[PDB]
Amino acid sequence: SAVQQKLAALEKSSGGRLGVALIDTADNTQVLYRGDERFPMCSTSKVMAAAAVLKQSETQKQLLNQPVEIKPADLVNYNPIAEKHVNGTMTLAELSAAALQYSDNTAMNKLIAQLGGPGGVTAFARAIGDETFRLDRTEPTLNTAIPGDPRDTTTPRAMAQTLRQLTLGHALGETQRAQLVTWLKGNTTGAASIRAGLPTSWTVGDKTGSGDYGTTNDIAVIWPQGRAPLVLVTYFTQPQQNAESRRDVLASAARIIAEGL
Ligand SMILES: [K+]
């Protein structure tokens, strides 16, 4: 009830720019707020890169076990897992899990390199019907989040549709879809974001993102108790380059959505 009024009020109180896209797969209804505006994805783009490598592994059947060298010079600004394996190797499965569940930026860069560069991630998006997503840069510069810059952006509507196809539809093969869902459900970074606005009994798999301009993002698949899953994207960015993160705004958006549901 009055979901538009409530989301607009939350955005006004927050001082920033809020983008929401819900898909309720019980009946295919949607709730959209700035659903067609572009937002900087930051680490939520790791879902598209991991999924692209999963798709590659449908035909390169041992790809996920392939070792990748981690060198000291490869470390960027946030490498909680890769720093443990510097001067050694990680497999592409280990890199995918590190990217998704710890938001490891060096792991992201290895996924991007496996796909031939940022354009390889965009090409996979196009192959699964996403004409809006674009990845332009590697980590860490994909997080600059400059207002009006289309680089490394998507819209909430497009990201929600793609996350539905990846996790609940058939953009991936059955084993690969299950692997993506397993990884998202094991995320370590999400308890303050969409999850915090939802009943604790619900099952959530999500990927967070953060960057400059206080950009604070989360994209989630949600299995509510006793009903069909939801897909929810909450993107948020702020006027000041050095603004603080606002995961509470994402939780507040999710809580509004769960009320009107
Ligand atoms: K920040």
Numbering used by the authors: 27 to 57, 59 to 238, 240 to 252, 254 to 290
Paper text:
By combining microcrystal electron diffraction with native mass spectrometry (ED-MS), we develop an approach to rapidly and accurately determine structures of biosynthetic or clinically relevant ligands bound to enzymes. We demonstrate this approach with the model protein lysozyme bound to its noncovalent ligand N,N′,N″-triacetylchitotriose (ACT), then use the cysteine protease papain as a scaffold on which to bind a panel of both known and potential inhibitors, including the epoxide-based covalent cysteine protease inhibitor E-64 (27), its commercially available chemical analogs, and analogs generated by biosynthetic reaction. Last, we extend the ED-MS workflow to interrogate crystals of the β-lactamase enzyme, CTX-M-14, which imparts resistance to β-lactam-containing antibiotics by hydrolyzing their four-membered ring structural motif. Overall, our results demonstrate that structures of protein–ligand complexes can be obtained directly from microcrystal slurries by ED-MS, with unambiguous confirmation of the identity of the bound ligands.
We last aimed to assess the utility of ED-MS for resolving ligand binding in a protein of interest for drug development, the CTX-M-14 β-lactamase, referred to simply as CTX-M-14. Crystals of CTX-M-14 were grown, crushed into a slurry of nanocrystalline fragments, frozen on TEM grids and interrogated by MicroED. Using the same data collection routines established for papain, MicroED tilt series were acquired which yielded a 2.5 Å resolution structure of the apo-form of CTX-M-14. This structure was comparable to single-crystal XRD structures determined on macroscopic crystals grown from the same batches, and offered a clear view of the antibiotic binding pocket surrounding catalytic residue serine 70.
